[PDB]
Amino acid sequence: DPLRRTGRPFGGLIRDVRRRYPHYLSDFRDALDPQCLAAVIFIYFAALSPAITFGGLLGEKTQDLIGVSELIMSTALQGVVFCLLGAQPLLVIGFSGPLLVFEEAFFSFCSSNHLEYLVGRVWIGFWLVFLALLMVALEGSFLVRFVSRFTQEIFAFLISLIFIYETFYKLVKIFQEHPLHGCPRGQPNTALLSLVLMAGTFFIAFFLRKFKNSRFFPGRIRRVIGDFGVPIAILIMVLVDYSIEDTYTQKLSVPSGFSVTAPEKRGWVINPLGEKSPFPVWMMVASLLPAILVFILIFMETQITTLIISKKERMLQKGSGFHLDLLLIVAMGGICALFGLPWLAAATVRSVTHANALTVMSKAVAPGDKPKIQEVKEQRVTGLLVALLVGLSIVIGDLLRQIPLAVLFGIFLYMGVTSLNGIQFYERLHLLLMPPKHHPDVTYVKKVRTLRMHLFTALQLLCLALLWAVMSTAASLAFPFILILTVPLRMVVLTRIFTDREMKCLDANEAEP
Amino acid sequence: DPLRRTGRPFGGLIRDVRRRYPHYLSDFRDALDPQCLAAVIFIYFAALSPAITFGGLLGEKTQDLIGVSELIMSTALQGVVFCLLGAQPLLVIGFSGPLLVFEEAFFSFCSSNHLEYLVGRVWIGFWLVFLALLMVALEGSFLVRFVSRFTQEIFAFLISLIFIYETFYKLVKIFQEHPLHGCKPRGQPNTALLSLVLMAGTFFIAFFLRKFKNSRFFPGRIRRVIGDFGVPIAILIMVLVDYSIEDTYTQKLSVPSGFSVTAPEKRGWVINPLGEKSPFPVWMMVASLLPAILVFILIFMETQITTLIISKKERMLQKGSGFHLDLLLIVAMGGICALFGLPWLAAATVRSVTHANALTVMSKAVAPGDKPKIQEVKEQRVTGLLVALLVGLSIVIGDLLRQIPLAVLFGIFLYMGVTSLNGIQFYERLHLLLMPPKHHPDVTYVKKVRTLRMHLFTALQLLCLALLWAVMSTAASLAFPFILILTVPLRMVVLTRIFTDREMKCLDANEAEP
Ligand SMILES: *[C@@H](S)Nc1ccc(CCc2ccc(NCS)cc2S(=O)(=O)O)c(S(=O)(=O)O)c1
Ligand SMILES: O=S(=O)(O)c1cc(NCS)ccc1CCc1ccc(NCS)cc1S(=O)(=O)O
């Protein structure tokens, strides 16, 4: 029982270290496998592109104080450190939306009150470090036991439906800028060529995915070719685009040189005191509240991601760490805030994709259903390699300018669609449309009436819709608290409506029950 | 045994009439089924488009002596009298490639020798009628019993593959006239890519609805009704999508206006058997027997092989087919329509197969293992008659038809070509080449035949198909029917020595589960 309160200071941290660190050389020996190369290549782009996008957005929102280079250099240096000293090396940490919202809100607050922004974030980082140390000392990561499977599949369907809505609203906007008229802002043949490239990439990678499980060719060649599906699709579509000469397509652009984005109003080291004018003393002690808010955000997303990754269905044997994963992340964020780099948190879709890009499926028997997961092939090399490649991507800035963005949209759609399977809420959504005589032989259909599982699904959908509506309004910083409020809902309100057997069968801690 | 020599004049024709005509009202009362409407709508376009294409080509190649108003009126009047009086009403008859090749060759010959073309074809038609009557009287259609499944699976494969090359060539050439440079019409932008988008959308919606028809979603009746109307739904959706766009130019379907000949200044509706302007030489009247023999061979091979493919034992056809009352009605409506200047017609293989398998009903299954089996076919005389009548009256309408782009129909044609491939064993044995020997299914011809002696059969069949294609693509392509005929002596002599009796019996067998 990893989530147990020992009753001694730093007990959980010591237990996690003793559990994980003995299996150290195994991680480096396990990496010798040609599936690791495919995983590295696939995850490199999925980690690089959000860095550029969110760096551009954050540079636009602020006065060009934090840009793209700083985000890349924070991502690389936190990823390397975490993969070297982390308990769970299958997690990919990076910038996300809620952090951007908090950053813009804090910038607005600082600008309104005539305060320093970069100097202001240093005290927030210090308070973050203090809170992390206090929580690890008096161990409180045992509260993750109360997060069930009702509050962790209302949050992984919303973080996968908010990433397929905006991977195709970044196409409905290359077709409003370059519109289809006749006789850059007005180029022809661009909006349709982008559609062609995106469709080609996502239909190729999902047929190589189907071909991986087919009966054609020898097994070893078939599996090797199926592993390299995304790289093959990317290379094919890049060559196809390169063949065309006159048509203009937007291409991936990275900054040049290792330097700050505002070399005339900023430096690499931020003074804790006033950089130009003295910092008010009252703000030093009043900076505790934003520290609490950002701590709550980071804690919820990292812990829920770790819970989703470490399910018993996915055959993970070495173990996960709920104590040596939050201290590291929060301490790194607090330290990076001193140099002006942004804070980082584990990414859910990227971590899930990285985890399920290394799974090995059982060699079946004609009867067998969806093959079962045999192993996961976990190691400390893929994440470290991805983080350094992202770090050194500035030096190779000429090879990356030959890759259009429209090709990567198909890969992003592939990621979003693939990450959906494996959660029971999607399956219960599927069961709504099928007639009651075609339902499968799972444990929550046989022991539960048909009209009382649809009610559970309807309530879960109502909660998800409320979460989305709250996120889309002018007060979106209360989203973590609304998500937290689902736990008392399950523990109080849903207990009265449903009987003990129905609740036990519907959301069980494990498979079968 | 329909293919048996009775020994009496017109015995086969009488037997076919007595077998088929009693079940006459059944055909008209079977048509009350919403799958028939979907079949009619699907086959209407598949019959209309080749008429326009081949009419344009033949008008180009014959100095506008036969156009697309003579191809839309031979296709519609010679197919309302094969479903009214035909033994097999699941056949769709229309113009094809070999007929076009023969027509251009005959036009060249007539132009070289200063002869009349339209007057020249009348005697060929008369000799065709005489040959058909002579062959039916002697009941010579029993020779179809010697065409196996080695010489009729080669044909199916070639025809579907040459219909999937021509759809791809139409696209390759919309991007050669309108190229991606950027700055009836030529050089327009956004056209070559929009055509690709429309074609891909139609094709993928067609397969999506085809797969949804067999899914477990929605009630069964609604699911099957929606799955039946897959092609019409895809066509309507893509037509609306194209109609939404305003400025981009796309080529659209065009039909002639009015019921009249294409050259009203050098042609009429009735061709005089004698000289139209100058007297016709007497020697040609008797020398026209050879082209009549050639066109008779072409029509006979096409129609009989199509009827053989349609009437397999696997597809649950119960009323019966006619090998005699379908070669006196096709080679004698043709023959006598050419005294009015209309072209000859023969049964179309892909269109007939599509029409046949668009009415099949698959069994309600149980659990995975084999693909559902055919339960029935739902054969009737109404769908073909309605399609022919609609093709005939497609001239008064056409303001509606000018709103339909060609790029949408290319996806439907590709769907037809891909779908028509399944059901023949040569494709399955081609699939078995790539799979390892431990994944072969439990069919009768894998269990009883060694692995390395079925690959040899497949290789020889591929060699024959490649030789057929090479001969078809050279400057002497009128010998293709004879090269196809030569496969029967090959199977009956050469392949007997190489393979043992058991291997030949299992490989090529008259019926599933030898
Ligand atoms: C491709 S990276 N384009 C994307 C733009 C934005 C996002 C994040 C969307 C988002 C989610 C949640 C919140 N508030 C939670 S308190 C705000 C936003 S915002 O629109 O950025 O402001 C993404 S992705 O979800 O990370 O894929 C992609
Ligand atoms: O094979 S098809 O009947 O689909 C066809 C389609 C098109 N374009 C879209 S309708 C164009 C031509 C054809 C017929 C191809 C063909 C097949 C055989 C022969 N010779 C046999 S002796 C000749 C042709 S041809 O039309 O290219 O001359």
Residue numbers in the entry:
A (entry chain B): 673 to 855, 894 to 1223
B (entry chain A): 673 to 855, 893 to 1223
Cite, word for word, the article reporting this structure.
Anion exchanger 2 (AE2) works at high cellular pH to catalyze the exchange between the intracellular HCO3− and extracellular Cl−, thereby maintaining the pH-homeostasis. Here, we determine the cryo-EM structures of human AE2 in five major operating states and one transitional hybrid state. Among those states, the AE2 shows the inward-facing, outward-facing, and intermediate conformations, as well as the substrate-binding pockets at two sides of the cell membrane. In conclusion, given the presently revealed structural models, the AE2 uses NTD as the intracellular pH sensor to mediate the anion-exchanging activities of its TMD, thereby maintaining pH homeostasis.
